[PDB]
Amino acid sequence: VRMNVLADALKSINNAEKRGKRQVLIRPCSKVIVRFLTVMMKHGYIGEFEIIDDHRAGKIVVNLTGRLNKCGVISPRFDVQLKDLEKWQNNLLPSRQFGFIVLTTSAGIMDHEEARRKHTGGKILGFFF
Amino acid sequence: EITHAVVIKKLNEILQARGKKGTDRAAQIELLQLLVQIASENNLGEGVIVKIKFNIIASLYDYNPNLATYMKPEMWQKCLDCINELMDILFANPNIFVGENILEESENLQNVDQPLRVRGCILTLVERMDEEFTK
Amino acid sequence: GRMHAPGKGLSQSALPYRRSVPTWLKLTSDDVKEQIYKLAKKGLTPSQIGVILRDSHGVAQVRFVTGNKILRILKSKGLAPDLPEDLYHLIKKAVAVRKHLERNRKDKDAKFRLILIESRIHRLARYYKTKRVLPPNWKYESSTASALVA
Amino acid sequence: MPLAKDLLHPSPEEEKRKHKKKRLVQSPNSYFMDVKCPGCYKITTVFSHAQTVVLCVGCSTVLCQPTGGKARLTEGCSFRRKQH
RNA sequence: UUUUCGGAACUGAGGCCAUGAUUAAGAGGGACGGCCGGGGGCAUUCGUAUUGCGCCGCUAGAGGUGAAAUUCUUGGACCGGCGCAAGACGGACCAGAGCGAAAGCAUUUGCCAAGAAUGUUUUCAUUAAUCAAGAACGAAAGUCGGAGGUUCGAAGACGAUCAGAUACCGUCGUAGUUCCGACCAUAAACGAUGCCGACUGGCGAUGCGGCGGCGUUAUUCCCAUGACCCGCCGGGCAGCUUC
RNA sequence: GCUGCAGUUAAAAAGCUCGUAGUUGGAUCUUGUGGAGGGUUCCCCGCCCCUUGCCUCUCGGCGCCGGCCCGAAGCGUUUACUUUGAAAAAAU
């Protein structure tokens, strides 16, 4: 089956970081997972990552540090309209000061902090902190 | 016993399991012998038993668990008898008896590849048999 | 895993990354085609065809010495069958079961297994028939099973 | 696991002794072979897991035998891969 | 009057397109190969015991219980020997072993159809997952109609034990227990633990398939494939170990 | 108990499987450079092939010197989503 790919992905890197690891193997490589981890890399929670290529769908390998505490998925994907936002981020984050809800908009995939400056609502995907 | 179609198909189905781990490996020869001694008709031929006769002296080959060995002299003499009989059938006669159509009777093996190196499947045998004598 | 058994298992074929020729080989695209057409005359069906090439002839597969699959080559001629062999082999099995079931009415195990193989036909049929590969009026019954396998 | 092990670059056969679809790239565990025994003086090419009887055009008419995996050849050498 | 122009409709042969197919899921279906199992159906074969019967031999007690008695017995039991018949049943071997969706499944041999796992550089190309409606199977007991009825045995009749004893215990014994054809749909039908998928420790075993190997071992004298030893890869029943 | 519950033993997974509706479902079809707004690359015109995809034109203005150029007219296969407008009785 593997109904939702992204939802199975994050639990590995969540589990792996707890035990004390710094290399993982996540499959089967969706484009959606790439742009997620790109945003998550900029802020600094993970390091550079290598995309292995296969014809089947690829495999991805990540280098990570203890800075991450947990990245979760939120499924199914609800809408946000920039007044629903404040209610979401209260429940899902440890603090106002830091933590980053991610979402996708027509202006691309980004954190919530950026979307507020573009006046774009959209569909929420996950979170991390 | 009935027009060379059941017959031919059972030919097929006996020359199929030819190889595998379940062979019996000597009562395929036997069963080729049980489509000949119970092959007692007419025109049709003397005629087309020749080729079966190949295949079946080829039973009189393949029994043998491999290429390094040497061939119980009774087996050797049975081989001979076969080949010798399959000179009989193939002087007397001349039609060439895995092809060259006539009037018909009674084939089809134009339709597989060429009458002819299955015609040339008598030299093969005899060279093989030279080599077996050599062994 | 399995769709009418509880089991789970791996035995799937695994292809190399490469896909050249590779170098060592012969029988240009065209040579492979006439090599195939002869086999389909003899009743060798597309699955059997690729096997008998792969085992004893120089091909790795007939998808890297041609730009098409084994089946599409046969289909372009018009010499393809009117139903897929996959569907045929399901129907082929279930008739013998029904014969054994008439000869023995106390083989409840066979009766059980028939329900599976029966329902597996109907599911497969609902793939093809929506895709316009079968008539949208064709159904599976005892009578139509008898005639279509012969 | 020592819980720090590399996975980018594996050992030549101490981390490529694994199942073929649990490797980083999927490889077959099969090969071809160029033969040419005497029973049939011709340069034949045959797949390792024959699955079917391979015939001979010489005095012999059998070369292989399909078992439960690889294929048991015969009294004829003829061996190569080549390369794959 | 006639062309022309415009719009519309339909037919042939020919140029120009890089002239048009994403991969094959550590998803599923299907083919192919060699195997595996108290899986199922049908037919067939065998063993000992138990009970009954006949015959032979010896003579007084035999059954049974905590202790007894009912009961059995010189037309003779029990006991020993020999043969025959009937029905029932597959011991020891038989295991934190195997197969089946579950209920369940052990004497021989053959036939009939079915299935898992593994192997594969074969085929199809998303055909999937879970499920109201609806459907198949479903222990034992019970019901209806036939066959059979050794053994055990609800009910029932006796003998004891007990203040009482409709019981536990002993003797006898009907239905039932067995087979064939219809019904019945329930169980502590219990791992008291939904099904499908992903990720996350260590270690030694066992059943099946495949692959790799210093060697002993079988035979025909010698790499057919057998047994034993060591290691590796799948999926399966389980175990041990821990901040 | 949607946010936000529980079902080995405390109340509790249909005996078991098949199966339509319903719900849910893998991977894959575009990136860099000058000017402008903000850093030291990165986010309104354009450029490599594309750039609000096209034409065809003709009627009514803008041009420049009969001739030529560019706005408005059909639209990019269809929806959900999101963002901006319009339109929303009072009292509360």
Curated annotation (Swiss-Prot), chain A:
The gene is RPS15A. Coiled coil: none annotated. Component of the small ribosomal subunit. Part of the small subunit (SSU) processome, first precursor of the small eukaryotic ribosomal subunit. During the assembly of the SSU processome in the nucleolus, many ribosome biogenesis factors, an RNA chaperone and ribosomal proteins associate with the nascent pre-rRNA and work in concert to generate RNA folding, modifications, rearrangements and cleavage as well as targeted degradation of pre-ribosomal RNA by the RNA exosome. Required for proper erythropoiesis. This is Small ribosomal subunit protein uS8. It comes from Oryctolagus cuniculus (Rabbit). One of its GO terms (biological process) is translation. The lineage of its organism: Eukaryota, Metazoa, Chordata, Craniata, Vertebrata. One of its GO terms (molecular function) is structural constituent of ribosome. Transmembrane segments: none annotated. Component of the 40S ribosomal subunit. Part of the small subunit (SSU) processome, composed of more than 70 proteins and the RNA chaperone small nucleolar RNA (snoRNA) U3. Pfam families: Ribosomal_S8. Belongs to the universal ribosomal protein uS8 family.
UniProtKB/Swiss-Prot annotation, chain C:
Transmembrane segments: none annotated. The modification N6-succinyllysine is found at K26, K33. The gene is RPS13. HAMAP family: Ribosomal_uS15_A. Its main location: cytoplasm. The lineage of its organism: Eukaryota, Metazoa, Chordata, Craniata, Vertebrata. Belongs to the universal ribosomal protein uS15 family. The modification Phosphoserine is found at S29. The modification N6-acetyllysine is found at K26. One of its GO terms (molecular function) is small ribosomal subunit rRNA binding. Ubiquitinated at Lys-26 by RNF14 and RNF25 in response to ribosome collisions (ribosome stalling). Component of the small ribosomal subunit. The ribosome is a large ribonucleoprotein complex responsible for the synthesis of proteins in the cell. Part of the small subunit (SSU) processome, first precursor of the small eukaryotic ribosomal subunit. During the assembly of the SSU processome in the nucleolus, many ribosome biogenesis factors, an RNA chaperone and ribosomal proteins associate with the nascent pre-rRNA and work in concert to generate RNA folding, modifications, rearrangements and cleavage as well as targeted degradation of pre-ribosomal RNA by the RNA exosome. The modification Phosphotyrosine is found at Y37. Gene3D superfamilies: 4.10.860.130, S15/NS1, RNA-binding (1.10.287.10). There is a cross-link at K26 (Glycyl lysine isopeptide (Lys-Gly) (interchain with G-Cter in ubiquitin)). It is found in: Cytoplasm; Nucleus, Nucleolus. Keywords: Acetylation, Cytoplasm, Isopeptide bond, Nucleus, Phosphoprotein, Ribonucleoprotein, Ribosomal protein, Ubl conjugation. GO terms for biological process: translation. There is a cross-link at K42 (Glycyl lysine isopeptide (Lys-Gly) (interchain with G-Cter in SUMO2)). Component of the small ribosomal subunit. Part of the small subunit (SSU) processome, composed of more than 70 proteins and the RNA chaperone small nucleolar RNA (snoRNA) U3. This is Small ribosomal subunit protein uS15. GO terms for cellular component: cytosolic ribosome; cytosolic small ribosomal subunit; nucleolus. InterPro entries: Ribosomal_uS15, Ribosomal_uS15_arc_euk, Ribosomal_uS15_N, uS15_NS1_RNA-bd_sf.
Curated annotation (Swiss-Prot), chain D:
Residues 1-16 have a biased composition (Basic and acidic residues). Zn(2+) binds at C37, C40, C56, C59. Gene3D superfamilies: Zn-binding ribosomal proteins. It is found in: Cytoplasm; Nucleus, Nucleolus. One of its GO terms (biological process) is ribosomal small subunit biogenesis. The modification Phosphoserine is found at S11. Disulfide bonds: none annotated. A zinc finger (C4-type) spans 37-59. Keywords: Cytoplasm, Metal-binding, Nucleus, Phosphoprotein, Ribonucleoprotein, Ribosomal protein, Zinc, Zinc-finger. GO terms for cellular component: cytosolic ribosome; cytosolic small ribosomal subunit; nucleolus; postsynaptic density; small-subunit processome. GO terms for molecular function: structural constituent of ribosome; zinc ion binding. Binds 1 zinc ion per subunit. PROSITE patterns: RIBOSOMAL_S27E. Residues 1-23 are annotated as: Disordered. InterPro entries: Ribosomal_eS27, Ribosomal_eS27_Zn-bd_dom_sf, Ribosomal_zn-bd. Its cofactor is Zn(2+). Component of the small ribosomal subunit. The ribosome is a large ribonucleoprotein complex responsible for the synthesis of proteins in the cell. Required for proper rRNA processing and maturation of 18S rRNAs. Part of the small subunit (SSU) processome, first precursor of the small eukaryotic ribosomal subunit. Component of the small ribosomal subunit. Part of the small subunit (SSU) processome, composed of more than 70 proteins and the RNA chaperone small nucleolar RNA (snoRNA) U3. Belongs to the eukaryotic ribosomal protein eS27 family. This is Small ribosomal subunit protein eS27. It comes from Oryctolagus cuniculus.
